[PDB]
Design a protein around this ligand. Sequence first.
Ligand SMILES: Nc1nc2c(ncn2[C@@H]2O[C@H](COP(=O)(O)OP(=O)(O)NP(=O)(O)O)[C@@H](O)[C@H]2O)c(=O)[nH]1
Lengths: 709, 133
Amino acid sequence: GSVPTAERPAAIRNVALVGPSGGGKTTLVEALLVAGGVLTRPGSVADGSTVCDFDEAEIAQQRSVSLALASLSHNGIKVNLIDTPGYADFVGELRAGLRAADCALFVIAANETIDEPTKTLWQECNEVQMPRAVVITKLDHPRANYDAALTAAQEAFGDKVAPLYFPVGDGESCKGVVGLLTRTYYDYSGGTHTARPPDGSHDAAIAELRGSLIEGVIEESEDETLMERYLGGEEIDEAVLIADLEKAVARASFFPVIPVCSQSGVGTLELLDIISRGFPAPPEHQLPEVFTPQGAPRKPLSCDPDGPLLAEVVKTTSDPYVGRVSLVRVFSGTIRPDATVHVSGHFSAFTDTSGSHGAAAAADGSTHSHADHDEDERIGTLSFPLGKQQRPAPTVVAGDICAIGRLSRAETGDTLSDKTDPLVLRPWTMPDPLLPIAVAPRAKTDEDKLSVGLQRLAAEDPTLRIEQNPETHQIVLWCMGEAHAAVVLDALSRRYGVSVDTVELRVPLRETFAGKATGHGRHVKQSGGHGQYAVCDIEVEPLPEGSGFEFVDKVVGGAVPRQFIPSVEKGVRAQMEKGVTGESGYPVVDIRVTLFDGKAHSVDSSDFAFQMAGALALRDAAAATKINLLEPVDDVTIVVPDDLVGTIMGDLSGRRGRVLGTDKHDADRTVIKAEIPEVELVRYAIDLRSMSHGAGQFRRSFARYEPMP
Amino acid sequence: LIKLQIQAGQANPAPPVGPALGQHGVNIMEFCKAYNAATESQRGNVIPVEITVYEDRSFTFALKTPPAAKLLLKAAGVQKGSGEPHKTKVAKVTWDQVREIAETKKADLNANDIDAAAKIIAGTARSMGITVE
Ligand SMILES: Nc1nc2c(ncn2[C@@H]2O[C@H](COP(=O)(O)OP(=O)(O)NP(=O)(O)O)[C@@H](O)[C@H]2O)c(=O)[nH]1
């Protein structure tokens, strides 16, 4: 159909659809687009004809793995649908979609109840005070009980959840719904949407539903006399109730329930009407706090095309022919083609908190550690995403989302604004991946481009963390889970031509002397030039942890020439650095070396010879005693339900974990604080999601180093 | 229908009571504030508290007398009990403190007379390896 174009931010809606993995979100989006006229017939995820599930990975996994955007205009109101994956491994994409949205939509099926991942998704949506609306789908399923799921929703997320539309079906294929506020029964039995008054088969239940909905809304209505009036017998006007419901939903105070038949197309039209009326506008939505480049807080801009230019890229995609396709979320100002705009790369200062080992701020890619970058780029032709097709856009007003190609250095999450007024929207919450994945490149040609490919990968996916080990010299990919790790590996192996092989993550270790010992170092070599002769008799004794390297001089009579003692010290330091345990010795710290005697030659004494003699003496002293191996430990804070406390505690008991305390996270979850050695945490996430029906959520942070038990 | 031992002036510890009271259908904040007020009125010793629950999630807390273990420990002047009772003796207790604790336990126990409670406290100190004189 026609390209949905909006000229005022009020007429634009940006709602992110969320839910469980495979909740039929893609089918719902296809049905809505067909109802919008863009698509002639509804696509099917199984057939792969859907607009949303167009990427290779989505069809390969037969489930949403990456988020997509669709644009629709209905009743003169444009809606920017944001379908997001429903699996925990892709939580960061869902959060990014939430940030770029002014509302949250939950697509759930009546035949299955609310799972714990859906509850955590509701919590995540709640902790931005986002408005949430409940959409029941898959009503064609035989086991689809709208009443049971509705109840569960009403009981779980407080009394603020009350249904808004009452379906009337046969229990197999819902033929239509009853409008509770409008007292109108919508019918689709003949294949046409017909709105007619209910015949009275549900009139008592309908009246009950209106009463409950009115009492719930009217409380949230500012008119406290409305409650009296309704309880006094006065019939509150339908338009007034509608407006009060719209305001309350814009206040993120109510969570209505609307049943939808994605397959049959039942309820799509009313659903679009509810999106266009009851949903908050970006002007109504509490726009995110906009910050100045230098960290000084700035007053948030009103959502208007005439205001100061303010936009934000929220997705980065790589295409072999088109190039980078960056989706830009605009909040204030107007974007016009060929204009030069300022690219604020997250200004990492706002994202430098925590980050564990990787200290991830934005776009990682250690050669690009932190983003914090500023650059002004001239944009090309504005476009809107329609699958792989890009509908050209004349101008981009505030409050809308657009796709821009050929962007050289634009990245996901970057704040776009006028170059004269650089701005910085508050960045989204980035989940920290805690599944390290060490890999090894197949060739140095791949390795050289590995930095560029990983930088671009983190530009596309801000949730992936990449850390290159400085001690073990291993490149390690931190991922959310099995699916996310697979996606990270595949995209690196294809989009950038970097052939890598996953290798074992090496946990850094430290070495120190376990006792006092002495070493005799001799370096005699008779080559074709000057002979070499240097002997050092050093004494190494243990030091308290963190004492570092101390040198004590006890040379008597100057047997070691005093010009070569610093060479002995340098050799000792180098030998500590190179390790003292075999061919794979870890750095030696917190030791003291006491050179008390030695031998030298009048002609064959050299600084290098004394360096070698000191290194060999240190090696002999290390071989003259035991060496302490120090392994690191990371504190782990876990949120798990109280019913599984014992299983996780016993699992940590088999994982040598030291329990620190069990803190009540809430009425049903307990925060568990414990420090676990990093070796035990290599596969902790996968086993935990097992030990928890996925409910297992934890964070880790390096604590200190301890010797191996 | 549970019973725990908790510090007088402290409320909401995570290991001992939190999850213990969470799965018994007991509101925790009201219990903590009332118990804190009562044990600040007492202000002297850590106390055992018995929780009785009803079908309407109503909770009733019963505060007993200070434990014989803690009372004997504070009356004898020591902090921790003997690791080898009846072999290593760490403290000495006279009959006056024994009779004070006996009156307290008479307020607590089913003993008909003070002497029975005194004998009970003497046995408690025997489990503590503390001489009663
Ligand atoms: N009965 C029924 N099945 C549906 C419906 N929509 C999708 N399905 C089925 O559910 C599976 C995919 O659903 P869904 O998870 O929503 O697909 P997705 O959108 O790609 N994943 P996600 O929901 O996480 O975004 C397929 O087997 C598909 O046939 C629906 O409306 N009714």
